[PDB]
Scaffold this motif. Structure first.
Motif, PDB file in Angstrom:
ATOM      1  N   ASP A  89      -5.328  -7.094  -8.690  1.00 39.92           N
ATOM      2  CA  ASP A  89      -4.703  -7.756  -7.523  1.00 39.92           C
ATOM      3  C   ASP A  89      -5.786  -7.945  -6.469  1.00 39.92           C
ATOM      4  O   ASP A  89      -6.792  -7.229  -6.549  1.00 39.92           O
ATOM      5  CB  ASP A  89      -3.667  -6.856  -6.857  1.00 39.92           C
ATOM      6  N   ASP A  91      -5.452  -6.918  -3.600  1.00 35.13           N
ATOM      7  CA  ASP A  91      -5.400  -5.626  -2.882  1.00 35.13           C
ATOM      8  C   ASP A  91      -6.302  -4.643  -3.623  1.00 35.13           C
ATOM      9  O   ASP A  91      -7.033  -3.909  -2.957  1.00 35.13           O
ATOM     10  CB  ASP A  91      -3.961  -5.127  -2.773  1.00 35.13           C
ATOM     11  N   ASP A 144      -4.594   1.306  -5.803  1.00 37.56           N
ATOM     12  CA  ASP A 144      -3.499   0.353  -6.138  1.00 37.56           C
ATOM     13  C   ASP A 144      -2.985   0.635  -7.550  1.00 37.56           C
ATOM     14  O   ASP A 144      -2.372  -0.270  -8.124  1.00 37.56           O
ATOM     15  CB  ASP A 144      -3.920  -1.109  -5.967  1.00 37.56           C
ATOM     16  N   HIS A 168       0.437   2.377  -3.370  1.00 38.13           N
ATOM     17  CA  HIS A 168       1.501   2.125  -2.365  1.00 38.13           C
ATOM     18  C   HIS A 168       2.727   1.573  -3.091  1.00 38.13           C
ATOM     19  O   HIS A 168       3.765   1.336  -2.445  1.00 38.13           O
ATOM     20  CB  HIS A 168       0.998   1.168  -1.283  1.00 38.13           C
ATOM     21  N   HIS A 169       2.611   1.388  -4.405  1.00 43.99           N
ATOM     22  CA  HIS A 169       3.730   0.797  -5.188  1.00 43.99           C
ATOM     23  C   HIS A 169       4.854   1.830  -5.311  1.00 43.99           C
ATOM     24  O   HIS A 169       4.556   3.034  -5.391  1.00 43.99           O
ATOM     25  CB  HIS A 169       3.205   0.226  -6.510  1.00 43.99           C
ATOM     26  N   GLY A 198      -2.935  -1.125  -0.744  1.00 46.68           N
ATOM     27  CA  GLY A 198      -3.961  -0.294  -1.394  1.00 46.68           C
ATOM     28  C   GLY A 198      -5.217  -0.256  -0.553  1.00 46.68           C
ATOM     29  O   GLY A 198      -5.793   0.834  -0.402  1.00 46.68           O
ATOM     30  N   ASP A 228      -0.833  -8.736  -0.816  1.00 44.49           N
ATOM     31  CA  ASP A 228       0.213  -7.867  -1.418  1.00 44.49           C
ATOM     32  C   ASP A 228       1.537  -8.148  -0.699  1.00 44.49           C
ATOM     33  O   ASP A 228       2.562  -7.585  -1.118  1.00 44.49           O
ATOM     34  CB  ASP A 228      -0.202  -6.393  -1.384  1.00 44.49           C
TER      35      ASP A 228
HETATM   36 MG   LIG Z   1      -1.417  -3.398  -3.882  1.00 46.09          MG
END
Ligand SMILES: [Mg+2]
Length: 756
Positions: A89, A91, A144, A168-169, A198, A228
């Motif tokens: 990603d 992020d 991440d 952070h997911h 992240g 994100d």
């Molecule tokens: Mg992320």
């Protein structure tokens, strides 16, 4: 008449900003209208949004933070080898760069690896973790990724390689077994802002390992936080204003090279980070791996940054082409399914590149407003791997979990998900989702909505008023970009622009405001005739030859004309079949709901109501008001089926009711068949109206009845002066007959034009 695609909900601000602050804070009418539609009115809020004091909370308050800081410091001291585990990603590439540079500044043997979306997938992979142990790696810091890698983490942790998880997911019910877990939303800890990306988590770990962080880090957090699509409130908001500040004042070498490949040099804001920079870093990890993007972000030598920015931009090229092709094929397949009446678009084909499938699905949901599954049939692996995108009225998780017996592996959420299934189960799954959707089609409305923040007038479209709106930026999740509505706008100039004449160029109003509707250059022939049009869209400033000019990017377009047609005696001549779906039928209880179109008055129809037929006479004018005050139509058909009338029969005066009670009190028990005619005589009333009177007396419980024999309940509750629900029903019915059935259509139109 052009038909609106969405159904427009305009926020009517109940509260307004003081005319003092409007002046104390130089609030031009546009910023004022936006603020009020977000209800931000008090001085604190407005300052909070316009202010620049940075939002900074001790990173030491994060989960397992100190536990982590020392674990890393020790590894650098004992010359331990490090490995930053990241994701493809934007992020994850921005987060990897921050941590690798942080560890390099701490003098560490740091190395990095980004999993391949295809060969490895997302998150910890056993092979890589073992490979790291084989390479002498002692500490793995994930970015991440990791919050859901319990198995892989434990295996390597038992091999003696510590893993620090930073993600952070959404967390699960179980946290993986690892030395430390840094997560803003962690059960055991509570950090002020829990919507960090992240890169944001990395920024805080960095701010803790090193007191003062390089300013590049702030711009990198900005790129990832906007990509994100995390909440653009609290902390995220300040870092973006800072990271957007940095990218303009002290633009980094890596990013400069990128925008030089795009050909972009204008001032940088969140959309650049959204549409320009973000989607380029993802392209690499969606076709090839993203190490290139990380290497671009990690390099500050113009020569290599430029060489590497070329290789990225090449991938951005191909993603446009691969997405373009897959969509061409898929838009063709979707048109057939929706024409056959599917409500879930499950499209499955071969040679469909998977790195871009989620992208292709978003274009499908926007074009059709239906939840979509997009699958690649890989007959060389007998699996169908694909992506899903949703509409708000449907959770992609629920409907797949209810059909999970046909699915082998599926992970995602309400708006999106990823899946892997058997090619032989697709045709079976599509029917199931369609069934689930056609059942929700009742309990729920599926027509696209749009939230409208402000109703803007031609007198607000000034260059000054439009740039001052560049003061409320940055705009994004939890602080969404404003959508403006403009009505009674003349179509001064109309043109079709583009090689294939697919975009529409327009001049609007008497002040001739320039407007553009992309991919809608097919509406020119309809807007050629001078006609007033209502519009929904964004306002920006287009600059040509140094000349700045206000421009409106249209998102939806409706014709202002409201047509009201008299079929009050031509019911069989309606231009539509009762089962037409596109037509809403407003009826009243006396009739049974036979079709879904048939919705009672007052009840909140939520299907797009462009064509409304008033089939039955409203029980009350206000019931119609309620069912009208929620109407967004282009053509109203007034049929008003009724079987009998009361206009001339009248409601007995209140002197007669007591003159009925007089007869009732005289005998106590009376039979109407033998006494009704004499009863009607002294009351000078008619048979039908006597029933009404006895029916209000029975409603007020003043009397009782059994097979024609009426009896008095002596002292009854003093409910009202004959003001019963049944008495009221008559009052309202005579009310609707006088204004609708026995009045002139002209005045009816001047009342329907009073409500809406
Ligand atoms: Mg992320």
């Amino acid at each position: 008449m052009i038909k609106p695609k969405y159904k427009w909900k305009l926020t009517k601000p109940a509260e307004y900003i003081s005319d003092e602050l409007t002046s104390k804070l130089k609030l031009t009418p546009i910023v004022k209208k936006i603020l009020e539609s977000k209800s931000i009115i008090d001085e604190q809020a407005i300052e909070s949004i316009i202010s620049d004091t940075d939002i900074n909370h001790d990173a030491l308050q994060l989960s397992d933070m100190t536990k982590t800081i020392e674990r890393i410091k020790r590894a650098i001291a004992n010359d331990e080898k490090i490995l930053v585990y990241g994701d493809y990603d934007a992020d994850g590439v921005t987060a990897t760069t921050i941590l690798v540079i942080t560890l390099q500044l701490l003098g560490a043997q740091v190395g990095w690896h980004i999993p391949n979306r295809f060969t490895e997938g997302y998150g910890p992979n056993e092979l890589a973790f073992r490979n790291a142990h084989d390479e002498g790696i002692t500490l793995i810091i994930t970015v991440d990724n990791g919050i859901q890698g319990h198995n892989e983490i434990k295996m390597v942790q038992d091999l003696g390689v510590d893993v620090i998880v930073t993600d952070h997911h959404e967390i699960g019910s179980t946290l993986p077994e690892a030395y430390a877990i840094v997560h803003p939303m962690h059960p055991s800890f509570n950090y002020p802002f829990q919507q960090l990306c992240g890169a944001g988590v990395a920024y805080k770990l960095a701010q803790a390992l090193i007191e003062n962080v390089p300013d590049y880090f702030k711009a990198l957090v900005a790129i990832g936080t906007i990509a994100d699509l995390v909440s653009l409130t609290d902390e995220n908001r300040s870092l973006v204003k800072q990271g957007l500040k940095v990218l303009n004042d002290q633009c980094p070498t890596s990013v400069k090279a990128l925008l030089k490949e795009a050909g972009y040099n204008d001032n940088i804001d969140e959309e650049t980070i959204g549409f320009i920079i973000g989607p380029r870093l993802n392209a690499v990890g969606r076709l090839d791996d993203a190490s290139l993007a990380c290497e671009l972000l990690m390099t500050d030598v113009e020569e290599e940054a430029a060489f590497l920015a070329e290789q990225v931009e090449h991938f951005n090229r191909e993603r446009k082409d691969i997405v373009a092709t897959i969509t061409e094929e898929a838009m063709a397949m979707a048109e057939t399914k929706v024409k056959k009446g599917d409500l879930f678009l499950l499209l499955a084909k071969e040679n469909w590149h998977e790195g871009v499938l989620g992208i292709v699905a978003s274009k499908i949901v926007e074009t059709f407003a239906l939840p979509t599954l997009i699958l690649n049939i890989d007959r060389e692996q007998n699996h169908a791997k694909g992506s899903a995108r949703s509409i708000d009225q449907v959770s992609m998780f629920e409907i797949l979990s209810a059909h999970q017996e046909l699915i082998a592996k599926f992970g995602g959420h309400h708006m999106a998900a990823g899946m892997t299934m058997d090619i032989e189960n697709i045709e079976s799954l599509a029917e199931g989702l369609n069934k689930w959707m056609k059942e929700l089609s009742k309990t729920t409305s599926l027509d696209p909505v749009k939230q409208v923040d402000v109703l803007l007038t031609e007198n607000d479209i000034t260059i000054k008023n439009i740039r001052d709106m560049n003061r409320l930026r940055p705009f994004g999740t939890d602080f969404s970009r404003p959508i403006f509505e403009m009505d009674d706008l003349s179509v001064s100039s109309v043109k079709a622009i583009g090689q294939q004449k697919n975009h529409l160029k327009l001049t609007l109003g008497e002040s001739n405001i320039a407007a553009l509707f992309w991919q809608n250059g097919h509406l020119e022939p309809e807007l050629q005739d001078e006609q007033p049009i209502n519009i929904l869209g964004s306002v920006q400033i287009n600059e040509w030859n140094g000349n700045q000019s206000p421009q409106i990017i249209i998102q939806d377009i409706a014709m202002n004309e409201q047509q009201i047609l008299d079929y009050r005696s031509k019911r069989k001549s309606l231009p539509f079949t009762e089962n037409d779906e596109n037509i809403v039928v407003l009826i009243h209880p006396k009739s049974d709901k036979v079709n879904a179109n048939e919705y009672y008055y007052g009840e909140e129809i939520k299907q797009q109501t462009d064509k409304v037929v008033l089939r039955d006479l409203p029980t009350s004018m206000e019931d119609l008001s309620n069912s009208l005050q929620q109407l967004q139509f282009s053509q109203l058909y007034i049929v008003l089926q009724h079987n009998h009338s009361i206009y001339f029969d009248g409601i007995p005066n209140m002197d007669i009711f007591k003159k009925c009670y007089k007869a009732l009190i005289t005998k106590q028990e009376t039979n109407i068949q033998k006494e009704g005619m004499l009863l009607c005589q002294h009351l000078s009333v008619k048979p039908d109206t006597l029933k009404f009177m006895l029916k209000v007396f029975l409603d007020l419980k003043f009397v009782t009845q059994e097979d024609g024999l009426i009896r008095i309940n002596q002292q009854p509750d003093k409910r009202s002066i004959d003001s019963s629900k049944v008495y009221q029903l008559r009052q309202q019915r005579m009310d609707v007959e006088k204004q609708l059935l026995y009045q002139d259509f002209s005045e009816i139109k001047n009342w329907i034009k009073s409500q809406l």
